[PDB]
Amino acid sequence: SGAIYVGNYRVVNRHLATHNDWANLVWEDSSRDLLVSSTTAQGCDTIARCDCQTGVYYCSSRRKHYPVSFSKPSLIFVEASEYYPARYQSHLMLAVGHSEPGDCGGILRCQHGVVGIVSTGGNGLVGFADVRDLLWLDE
Ligand SMILES: Cn1nc(C(=O)NCCc2cscn2)c2ccccc21
Ligand SMILES: [Zn+2]
Numbered sequence: 323s324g325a326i327y328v329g330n331y332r333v334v335n336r337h338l339a340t341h342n343d344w345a346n347l348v349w350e351d352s353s354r355d356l357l358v359s360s361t362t363a364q365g366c367d368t369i370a371r372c373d374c375q376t377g378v379y380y381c382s383s384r385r386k387h388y389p390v391s392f393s394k395p396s397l398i399f400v401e402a403s404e405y406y407p408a409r410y411q412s413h414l415m416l417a418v419g420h421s422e423p424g425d426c427g428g429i430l431r432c433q434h435g436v437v438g439i440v441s442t443g444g445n446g447l448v449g450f451a452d453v454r455d456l457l458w459l460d461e
Contacts, residue, residue, distance in 0.1 A: 323338060323382075323424070323426070323427045324380070324382075324426070324427025324428050324429060324439060324440075325427060325439075326365075326367050326369075326429065326436050326439065326453065327361065327363075327365025327366070327367050328365050328366075328367050328368075328369055328436075328459050328460065329364065329365060329459065329460065329461075330360055330361055330362075330364065330365075331348060331358050331359070331360065331361065331365065331459055332358065332359045332360075332361050332365070333356065333357075333358050333439070333453060333456075333459070334356075334357055334358075334359070334427065334439075335355050335356070335357070335426045335427055335439060335440075335441055335451070336350055336351070336352060336354075336355050336356055336357040337355060337403075337405035337406070337426070338426060338427060339357040339359070342359070343357055343359040344357075344359075346359040346360045346361075347359060348360050351412075352406075353409070353410070353411060353412045354411065354412055354413045354414075354451055355406075355411060355441040355442075355451050356413075356451050356453070358456075358459075367435070367436055368434075368435035368436065369435050369436050369453060369454065369456070369459055369460060370431070370432050370434035370435035370436055370437050370454055371434065371435075371454060371457075372432065372434045372454065373394070374432035374433070374434065374437065375391060375392055375393070375394065376389070376390070376391055376392070376432065377389070377390060377392065377430050377431055377432040377437055378390070378430070378431055378432075379417075379419070379428055379429065379430040379431070379440065379448070379450070380428035380429055381419070381420060381421065381425055381428060382424060382425050382428055383420065383421070383422040383424060383425050384420065388419055388420075390417040390418065390419050390430075390448075391417060391418075392415045392416060392417040392430070392437075392450065393415050393416050393417070394415065395412075395413045395414065395415055395452040395454075395455070396412075396413075396414060396415075397410050397411075397412050397414070398410065398411055398414045398416065398449070400414070400442045400449065401444065403423070411441070411442060411449070411451075413451060413452045413455065414441070414442065414449050414450070414451065414452070415430075415437075415438060415449065415450045415452055416447050416448070416449050416450075417447065417448050417449075417450070418446060418447060418448075419446070419447070419448040420446070420448070421440060421443035421448040422443070423443075425440050425443070425448075426439070426440050426441055427439055427440060428440045430450045436453065437450065437452065437453070437454060438450040438451050438452040438453050438454070439451050439453070
C-alpha cells in the first residue's frame with residue numbers, strides 16, 4: 323500500500339484504488355496502473371521534474387529503503403496478476419531490487435522529489451509507475 327499527496331490530489335496504484343478514490347476520480351490510466359482522486363486536505367509532497375536515473379525506494383516487505391539505478395519511463399510487456407492480464411504497461415521504469423505484491427504504493431524518490439510508485443515486480447526486478455510527466459499535479 324501507499325499514496326502521494328500533492329495539493330488537492332491523491333495518487334495511488336489504480337488496482338489498489340478504494341470506492342472513495344473512484345467516487346472522487348480526477349484521472350485514471352489502466353495502461354499505467356495509475357489513478358488520481360481529489361482530496362479536501364492540502365497535501366505537501368514534492369513531485370520531481372527531472373531525468374534522474376538514480377534514487378531510493380521504500381520496501382515494506384523489508385521495512386527498509388534501498389538505493390537503486392532505474393531505466394527511463396517506457397513501454398514494457400509485464401506478466402498477468404488477478405488485477406490485469408499480461409499486457410504492455412506504459413511509463414514504467416525497472417530496477418534491480420526486491421519486491422512483493424504488497425510493496426505496490428511505496429515511493430521512489432531522487433534529490434528533486436517523488437519520481438513514482440511501485441507497481442510491478444518479479445525475477446529480482448522492481449517496476450515503478452512514473453509520475454514526473456504529470457505536470458498538472460502542481461496546479
Ligand atoms: C511489486 N509487485 N507487484 C506485483 C503484483 O502482482 N501486483 C501489481 C499488479 C500489476 C500487475 S502488472 C502491473 N500491476 C508483484 C508480483 C510479484 C513480485 C512483485 C510484485
Ligand atoms: Zn531527480
